[PDB]
Design a protein around this ligand. Sequence first.
Ligand SMILES: Cc1cc2nc3c(=O)[nH]c(=O)nc-3n(C[C@H](O)[C@H](O)[C@H](O)COP(=O)(O)OP(=O)(O)OC[C@H]3O[C@@H](n4cnc5c(N)ncnc54)[C@H](O)[C@@H]3O)c2cc1C
Ligand SMILES: Nc1nc2c(c(=O)[nH]1)N[C@H]1C(S)=C(S)[C@@H](COP(=O)(O)O)O[C@H]1N2
Ligand SMILES: Nc1nc2c(c(=O)[nH]1)N[C@H]1C(S)=C(S)[C@@H](COP(=O)(O)O)O[C@H]1N2
Ligand SMILES: O=c1[nH]c(=O)c2nc[nH]c2[nH]1
Ligand code: MOM
Ligand code: MOM
Ligand code: FES
Ligand code: FES
Ligand code: FES
Ligand code: FES
Lengths: 304, 162, 162, 753, 101, 50, 51
Amino acid sequence: PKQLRFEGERVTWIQASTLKELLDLKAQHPEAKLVVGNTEIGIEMKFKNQLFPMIICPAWIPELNAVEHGPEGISFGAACALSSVEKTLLEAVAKLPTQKTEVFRGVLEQLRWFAGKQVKSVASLGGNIITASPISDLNPVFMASGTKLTIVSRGTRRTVPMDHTFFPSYRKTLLGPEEILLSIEIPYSREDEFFSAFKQASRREDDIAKVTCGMRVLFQPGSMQVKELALCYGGMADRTISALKTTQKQLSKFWNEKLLQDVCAGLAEELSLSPDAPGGMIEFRRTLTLSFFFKFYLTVLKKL
Amino acid sequence: DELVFFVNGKKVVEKNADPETTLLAYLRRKLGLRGTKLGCGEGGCGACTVMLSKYDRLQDKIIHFSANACLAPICTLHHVAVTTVEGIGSTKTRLHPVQERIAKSHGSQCGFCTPGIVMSMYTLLRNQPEPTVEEIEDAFQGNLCRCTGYRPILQGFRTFAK
Amino acid sequence: DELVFFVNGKKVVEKNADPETTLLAYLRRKLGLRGTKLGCGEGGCGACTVMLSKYDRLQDKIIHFSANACLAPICTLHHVAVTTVEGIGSTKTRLHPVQERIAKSHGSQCGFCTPGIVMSMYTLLRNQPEPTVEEIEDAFQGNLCRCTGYRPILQGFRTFAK
Amino acid sequence: TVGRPLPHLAAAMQASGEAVYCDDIPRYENELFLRLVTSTRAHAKIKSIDVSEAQKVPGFVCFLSADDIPGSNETGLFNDETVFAKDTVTCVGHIIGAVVADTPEHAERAAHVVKVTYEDLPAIITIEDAIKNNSFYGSELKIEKGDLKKGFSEADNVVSGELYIGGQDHFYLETHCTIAIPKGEEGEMELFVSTQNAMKTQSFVAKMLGVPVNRILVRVKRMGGGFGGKETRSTLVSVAVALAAYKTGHPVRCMLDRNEDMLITGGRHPFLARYKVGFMKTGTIVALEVDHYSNAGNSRDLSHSIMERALFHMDNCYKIPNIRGTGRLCKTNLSSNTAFRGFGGPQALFIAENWMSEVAVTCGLPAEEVRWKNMYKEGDLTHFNQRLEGFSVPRCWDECLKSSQYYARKSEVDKFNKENCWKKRGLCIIPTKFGISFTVPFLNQAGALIHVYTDGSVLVSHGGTEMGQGLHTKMVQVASKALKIPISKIYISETSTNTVPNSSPTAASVSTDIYGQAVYEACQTILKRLEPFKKKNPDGSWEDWVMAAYQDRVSLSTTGFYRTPNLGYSFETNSGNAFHYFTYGVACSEVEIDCLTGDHKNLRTDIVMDVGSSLNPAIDIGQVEGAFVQGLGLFTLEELHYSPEGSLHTRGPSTYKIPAFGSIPTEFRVSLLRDCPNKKAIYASKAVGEPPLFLGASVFFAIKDAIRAARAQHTNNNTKELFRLDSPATPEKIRNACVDKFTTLCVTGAPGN
Amino acid sequence: VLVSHGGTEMGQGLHTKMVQVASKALKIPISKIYISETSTNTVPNSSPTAASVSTDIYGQAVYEACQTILKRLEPFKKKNPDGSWEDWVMAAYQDRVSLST
Amino acid sequence: FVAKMLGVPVNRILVRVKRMGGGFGGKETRSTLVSVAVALAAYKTGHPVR
Amino acid sequence: DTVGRPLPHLAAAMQASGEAVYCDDIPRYENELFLRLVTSTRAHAKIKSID
Ligand SMILES: Cc1cc2nc3c(=O)[nH]c(=O)nc-3n(C[C@H](O)[C@H](O)[C@H](O)COP(=O)(O)OP(=O)(O)OC[C@H]3O[C@@H](n4cnc5c(N)ncnc54)[C@H](O)[C@@H]3O)c2cc1C
Ligand SMILES: Nc1nc2c(c(=O)[nH]1)N[C@H]1C(S)=C(S)[C@@H](COP(=O)(O)O)O[C@H]1N2
Ligand SMILES: Nc1nc2c(c(=O)[nH]1)N[C@H]1C(S)=C(S)[C@@H](COP(=O)(O)O)O[C@H]1N2
Ligand SMILES: O=c1[nH]c(=O)c2nc[nH]c2[nH]1
Ligand code: MOM
Ligand code: MOM
Ligand code: FES
Ligand code: FES
Ligand code: FES
Ligand code: FES
């Protein structure tokens, strides 16, 4: 299986066969666009009028396609199709015990009413994550769960749990210009750890103003007392954000009526929208942020 | 380099692949297989549905999955085999049961979304010969029909469950 | 080597001339100027009559002569300028008097031989603007017409003498 | 086979991908491609157009503008449009010109790269701007019956208010499409279009080219959907591609991408309505005053006729003694809005069902009791003084109540709502009637043309176009019955302007009626002519008769024609028939809403339509199902959204949501009403195309019921309050009206409740 | 006006002669009339164009066709004696009379 | 003759004749030796043929 | 009324310019194919094989 090269009117396409080839081509040409399923790039060239004169397709590279079951969680190469993610994860949910599968089930909810068998069969994971759509339905989940990301460039290799710093500005991620996303390990749910994922049913502007969230609480052992709390939202800014001030304020607080009141006051304050925020739908958007959390709150209480 | 893929079993050797060419454009306009339709070009309607098959050096097995042709660069398809509506049957030889079913069930009115629903269903059957009512209904989140109201299609295809 | 000639004033750069290509085939089928007709392919009917112009490094002058396009290899035409029936007039802009004359005189019936007679006469006029009845009548030994009985053509063209 | 469930004649070819649509036609060796160049400004002066960079694009052939047109640049139904824009653009999709190139791709690159330089002009975008800027086409249309002061004096309660219903995109799976072939002689041209209107395609091309209509041939095999958007608007592509063909002397084609189509082609008219209803504590309506405003966009097109059908349907199925309905067409800087399945009926009918639902709340009575009390009786006159004969709604209504088990399921609902706190259910039952006939009397005409060949086989041709509704199928059923021969011996190829001239657009749901009739006449003539040979040989076959007629030199070709008798409403006087008859129906629907997200399930729908004696139950059930789900789309799901500057954001499936597989009610039952022959149409049948769409509103109001219930739970305590809910009732609109501890700020701040 | 008939044009001027007849029968300019082609979907079961009788038989068929059109337009002609052919034609379409035969 | 050879009803077959460059009787009937052959080629290959 | 008057053939000018379209002058489709009849070289014979 050798590297192929195609040239046309305006674009050059290199089909890389080896992770070394890929890492080398990105170093030699940091501008080069990576393309797996094309479900995002395709849109950009046709409707948003971008020309990327230079494209690398890493689809063939093993690594990038590998599905590994480590002790922390399940790692997926960045090129695996959302449909593989969904299939691997459906099996995990049905095989392992409930308590270890909160995140997976979060991911699977976002995965439910999302595109179609056609899109999910060719859309990559890494593809979604790196695209950094403000209304990506997955990034809020990976963020709230602290999904570990393995990022590689020629020579260097780092792993980092995804958090708010990973999405710095509109459409930007925190990759260096030579780096590619190698893999993604979705975490196993711990004891005393619960998770939920909700999304606005509908969408009205291209990549803004669709509320979607991942939510995670970790309690002190056998208690109702909060140890970690993460509430991440898409659809409320130009990027996946985290409700850091709100959730910080609730550490070692008890999961009850009062905390509900504080979190909602917090969410209305910190994720507040100006009455001319892009996307409109101001009031509905507020209401989903709190209503989503209320569902989380109520669902956690049942899980407790 | 040469681009090599298959369509309806037939070898395609493209010596001057342009990276910008979508498979839809390639079928309709270079190959003349006009069964696959353009409906939106953004992957939302399914009118361009085809089935792709590649050998996966990993599962051992050959996999079959459905795909949007309006978004699929031919350049991703080296050593992949495409099957279109005209590849599974025809009123000239024999309709595939998927085709005959949608036809006799009044699941096709204007007909422009039919070839892709045929393909979306045909793909499911390739992966699961005896699928559930659950699996049949969900097989079509990526196909839109403006004519039928969907009820007759789902009823026609439900005969493939149990 | 490139083959370069002109057709109705437009440059033609053939990079892969086949020696076996006749001008008729080229006009009709590469250029899609369908006013020149195939009637026999052996030089006997004139349905394929064009005018050719070359600069003659000798007479000094540019010469204009008529030619059978079913028999002219494009390969003999380097630096030659072809003029066809669509090169001298048109109902879309203006008929050349040769065309208008044959029309109004009932010199055209089925009309398949008309382009070549127009061309045969047009050439005569390019070489002699005031020809004699004698020269007009003889200008046509290479054009056959199955329809008219020739009388009306000659009468109509006679108005070019004196 | 008439009355038997015969599958659509093309279905198997459609299932296989052998069925040929416009863009599937093979290309000529020299065929060229066109891409429209289009405004990016709502209202401006065009300062310059620069083609510099488009010229550099490989395969570029030419840029076309207003200057290239040889005949006229004046087009449209009411001559108020440009083929290409000249000095000023009047909306965002306004066509300025077009690039022609050797591939659709090269076309696309070249068009995208044309710089237009603009000079912004004051711009009227909303209905509200149009009113306050007094910006309308024509004057006020009006229907007035009885006497209002005295309706309102006599009235116990008087509810008034304001309502909005959003527009809608056709979303035909196949977008607009034209192939133009210029012949090279005498200005002749042959065109293959996806259009409902081959007669207007022909006129417009010819007017633009400056050539007589007899030089222009328009052929239409089939469409991948029409729903009204190809009644007129198809010509924005056709006329442009024709010009390209004229200018270059080559065949030229265009299919629009979705985003172009949704921008340019126009869709359903949004309506604003300001209303005042007068009623007794009983719920009997005593007076009604409605002013309608439609958002027309930048040309007249069909807007005027749309407002007429709206004014004819402002009563639904309700006897209203004192009634005044006005209508105003707003002239605005937006794509010209056009025909959409229902043609103003849906909008007027929804307005009506809106004040009706409020009457019933205000009176604290159940809705079905109030709807029923107010219903027309056999033989009542409409607010436009037409007699209602064979009014079959009570049958539809009882039968719908019974098989829908409405009174029992209503118990289950109030039950569910007492035991459920953040989820609620609704159930509603709604009638409709829909007038059958074009509002303009001259369009109610139809030709057919039959040849019988000497092998016995038959070629039918008629003015109607096939867009999925199964017109050709039904026509082939009629011929075959009329002629007393198997369907297998008959065929329809296509619609064309050279077989049937001056055809009305395939629209208004009357095509089976009028074309059916024309084919029937055609058949009859063929039957007279064969009679003698049938007598001379009573035991022979059809083929013998046919052969013996040819041997004896009797013509086996004839035209057929039909005129709808007795039409002609007058807006002064307020009398004469507007329609030939009405189609009637009733739907009941049950939804469950989520009060915390505004999301909802459609649990069950039951439908009983009066179609008379269906020519094809399968096709007709198929029409009811289709119409309904598009209505369900209109009222609950589909939303076009514009910038403050008039620029459309919603330009594909990803931001415009038409109904999906899983949208349809979980329990979706449709019945045709039995034993109700219609004397007024071919073989006792009825038009089915447009009339069912409005029954989709049954979900709008079931949702409104569910919202009512959520409010009584979590907000105030008025069993009798009325909140405004506009159309479409999307997730947003639904959530926001579930006023709760969340939508107010919780927190124990304070607001509403 | 679009005239179509069973006869084919091979140089003998059949279409010319048919156009002349239609224009005389209808009492309108030749310029307003056209024949595009001969086709089996406009006139079926046609005898070959032959035997020298085409002007005779097709001429007579076009005459009949014309007559029927003239009957049809008669009322509108009487209602508007001073109007143009185009007025009669338009008035007939508005009144839902067939202009095809 | 096209229909008979293809085995399909006559109503499936459309013949158009704009003009001829001469007939004189030779295209009264004999035209069909080409027509029928070209039609078959069109049938067998599914492409336009001349 | 031009009956009896010497009106020129209606297509003559187009025939004179070469705009008049005959069968072979109709543009070809992208995929259009070409047929050549194979024909006997014998007046009366039994066809024994075709190669
Ligand atoms: C109609 C339809 C519906 C959709 N619905 C949803 C939805 O409901 N929710 C949602 O979240 N998304 C949705 N999407 C978007 C879809 O999930 C993403 O488009 C997809 O995951 C991108 O994967 P791809 O293989 O197509 O990436 P490509 O388009 O091929 O490229 C993706 C981007 O990531 C970069 N990239 C790709 N791989 C790597 C890598 N390994 N390392 C570094 N950079 C990389 C590319 O350069 C590019 O910027 C939808 C798309 C369509 C077609
Ligand atoms: N499948 C399908 N059904 C359809 C349409 C369409 O485009 N596709 N258009 C509708 C509209 S707008 C009308 S007016 C009628 C038109 O056809 P008919 O007159 O034969 O009912 O069918 C309706 N049903
Ligand atoms: N120019 C011309 N004249 C012609 C022919 C022709 O092909 N070209 N055909 C001849 C023959 S064989 C006949 S039978 C008649 C038929 O046409 P008509 O019936 O209009 O005369 O035209 C005659 N004159
Ligand atoms: O003038 C019209 N009147 C109508 O009723 C109608 N319906 C569709 N299109 C129409 N046009
Ligand atoms: O009359 Mo239907 O074309 O909206
Ligand atoms: O032989 Mo002439 O009758 O065509
Ligand atoms: S065209 Fe709509 S998804 Fe491919
Ligand atoms: S039948 Fe027309 S879109 Fe499905
Ligand atoms: S074709 Fe007869 S001379 Fe060339
Ligand atoms: S006109 Fe027929 S050959 Fe001269």
